[PDB]
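Follow-up to my post from last week.
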Amino acid sequence: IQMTQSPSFVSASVGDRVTITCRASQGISSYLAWYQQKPGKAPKLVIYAASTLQSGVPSRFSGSGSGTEFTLTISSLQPEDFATYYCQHLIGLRSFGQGTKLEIKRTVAAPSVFIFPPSDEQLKSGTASVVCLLNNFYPREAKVQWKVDNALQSGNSQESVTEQDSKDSTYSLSSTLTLSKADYEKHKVYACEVTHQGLSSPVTKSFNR
Amino acid sequence: XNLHFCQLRCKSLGLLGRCAXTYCACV
Amino acid sequence: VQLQQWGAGLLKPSETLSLTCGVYGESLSGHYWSWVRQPPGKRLEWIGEIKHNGSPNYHPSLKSRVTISLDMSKNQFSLNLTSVTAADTAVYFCARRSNWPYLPFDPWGQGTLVTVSSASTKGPSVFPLAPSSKSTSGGTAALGCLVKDYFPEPVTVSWNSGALTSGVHTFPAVLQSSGLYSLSSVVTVPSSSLGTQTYICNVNHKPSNTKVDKKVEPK
Amino acid sequence: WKEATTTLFCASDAKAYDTEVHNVWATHACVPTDPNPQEVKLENVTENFNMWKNNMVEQMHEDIISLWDQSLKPCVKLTGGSVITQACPKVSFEPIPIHYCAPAGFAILKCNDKKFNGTGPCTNVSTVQCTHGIRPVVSTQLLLNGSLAEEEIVIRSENFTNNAKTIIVQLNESVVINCTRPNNDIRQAHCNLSKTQWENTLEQIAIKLKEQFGNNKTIIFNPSSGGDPEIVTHSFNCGGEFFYCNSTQLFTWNDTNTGRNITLPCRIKQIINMWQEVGKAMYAPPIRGQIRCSSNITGLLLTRDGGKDTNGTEIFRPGGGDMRDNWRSELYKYKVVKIE
Ligand SMILES: *[C@@H]1O[C@H](CO)[C@@H](O)[C@H](O)[C@H]1NC(C)=O
Ligand SMILES: *[C@@H]1O[C@H](CO)[C@@H](O)[C@H](O)[C@H]1NC(C)=O
Ligand SMILES: *[C@@H]1O[C@H](CO)[C@@H](O)[C@H](O)[C@H]1NC(C)=O
Ligand SMILES: *[C@@H]1O[C@H](CO)[C@@H](O)[C@H](O)[C@H]1NC(C)=O
Ligand SMILES: *[C@@H]1O[C@H](CO)[C@@H](O)[C@H](O)[C@H]1NC(C)=O
Ligand SMILES: *[C@@H]1O[C@H](CO)[C@@H](O)[C@H](O)[C@H]1NC(C)=O
Ligand SMILES: *[C@@H]1O[C@H](CO)[C@@H](O)[C@H](O)[C@H]1NC(C)=O
Ligand SMILES: *[C@@H]1O[C@H](CO)[C@@H](O)[C@H](O)[C@H]1NC(C)=O
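User reply:
Got it. Predicted complex:
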């Protein structure tokens, strides 16, 4: 049995109504619950038997469905409502949906870009890390490319992205390019190129070793 | 069950037929 | 009712995972008790569920390796998993079962991070991410700390012992090809403050009892 | 609180990992339970029951039908001129206990009377929430793996005076029966049971029979009068294989020593008349290896020859076919009511 949701990462504003769906590969009669989970913490029961609210859960929540089509609805999102929601078959293998992450919608916002050269302390060790920072941007999707002496660099670079920043609903992302000391010291120009919906065109930051 | 064929079969044993659920039984 | 969990979370392959879940505020009697795990970046997965009778109820993907049990004298229950591999890396949760006998899971334990790798515990190296006058975005400079090569997670990072909070971003750790984690923490501050204000990132990795403070100065 | 009708929640402690179909089906269709009944006696209450008019039986019947249909797939099936073919893998098959739970606002009633015949007033009534685990054994003539009568042997009928009504005999003592298709004719099988134990069983049933129909009556058991092989023989499913056992030796007895065990000759058939609906199904050949089941005979289903014409004599033959009587044999003490 398979749980299939609406294709998550959904973005919605506070005050908005939102509905996410769960589709089972075979029929199930109210053997269903919905959970809300925020990062780093355990899930909380919101609804079970498809349509029954767990006690303490606010009335703006509701759920319906039976068989293969199920629904979780929030009549009016509050800041506290933003989270990842899972559906779950309550019997059989007690399997979960893949989850629907519910993010806050806001205006497009271009990233501010900063580049940081490797420390002298770190080069002694045999590795050089170049860090490219995109601070406070929206939406979450952004493309970051590394260039050394005008050569696009191998996907060896690694990215990390924050959860939406509190208060302002933006994201931040770091990309780190790692080289050996020998490799680093044979090239001169180092650049990271950032592409994002908030830029009229791609922005480039660089320095010379 | 087929009652008619059940009846058609049992009489040939000297017997009446009736359904036992989805099965033919001779009486 | 509250569920508290304990147990060792850093394991090597072929070892046995042994976690325990204590129940406070309610008795085990007439109640189901279950374990659920959540691999990194993935969905929740049911592991198994138990009853006072003694009937053990497991998931098929874990039958020969898993044991779930009640410690009736302590109102505790436990999960055993033998011959663990890297694929068992996940946050493991315990959870009480609501009745009707409609289910399911409420309340929940706080979860235990379990990491399976052959990598040995190591404290982090901290490098500065120095601010420069190339990095003054309209009177705002950026600086940070590179926290590299530690294992396992997690680390905590603060700035100036908790006095610096605005503009702080601590990125999710990434797993390097070395089997070690790496992380950056950055902060934006006024450029004018660089010459008259100290900036130190405080980094803590309890698994190897390492606490590092690194001042970040301009160049 | 009058009897009402509504969809029920079945129950099973069935394990999720057991690849056996009953466990597999019960996990996806049923709830864990209980975790407690946990107690509900009703003081000074007398209630009329009717095991023969119980919506629970019909509903249960639908659950066991769905189970087989999902679990034991024939290669070919013919019903109403329509032909179905599908994959027909061999499966592991062994009836797990199944409970039946009433939904919200409802509650289940249990008859605890010692002599209780299945119809009429019960003086030792009690409530609960679910019936105890019933193994959904599909069989004719003999009832297997059921619940025993607490005191004496008990016989029940919708109308004892109606020869068309099935008589359900509930034993109070089990008779073990061993059925085997030996390792290495692959469709030939047999069952063994104690000859003396069975004779004693027949004797005690016969005693209860004389009590109901007249002590002047002579009691006779005779073989099936005929029909489908499924009801002429004692049939059952063992290990996914369909067994058809000659019960002539079991049902030839009169009042007016040879052999320690009774041995019944049996056959494994690929082609069967279906119990779920009118039709025939073809299954794949029997699995390899030793095939064996040890079961408790806990009851019997009998029909009685009418007559007349000479009278003074009562003739009984093995029956069954309608599996609702099988479920009734366990659900007879229960009814569902609406709380109002
Ligand atoms: C699990 O394995 C450990 C290993 O010594 C053992 O002590 C323990 O009793 C086992 N069972 C549980 C529930 O921890
Ligand atoms: C079972 O019933 C018989 C009569 O049918 C009776 O003699 C016997 O005592 C009963 N069983 C027990 C354990 O008393
Ligand atoms: C069962 O016993 C009751 C009690 O008198 C009786 O009324 C009823 O007719 C009996 N059931 C029959 C004869 O089928
Ligand atoms: C039982 O059947 C007989 C005939 O077989 C009939 O005379 C009698 O009224 C029936 N009793 C009922 C239906 O209670
Ligand atoms: C039937 O088999 C059981 C074990 O399966 C055995 O103990 C018993 O003696 C057997 N009965 C006969 C009559 O051989
Ligand atoms: C059942 O067995 C008896 C004797 O064991 C035999 O006479 C009878 O023909 C058998 N039934 C058949 C072959 O249908
Ligand atoms: C009755 O139960 C026994 C043991 O659990 C099993 O071997 C046998 O096959 C069962 N009988 C039927 C008809 O399912
Ligand atoms: C068969 O009966 C014996 C005692 O009569 C009991 O111990 C056993 O559990 C029964 N088998 C089943 C499958 O219920």
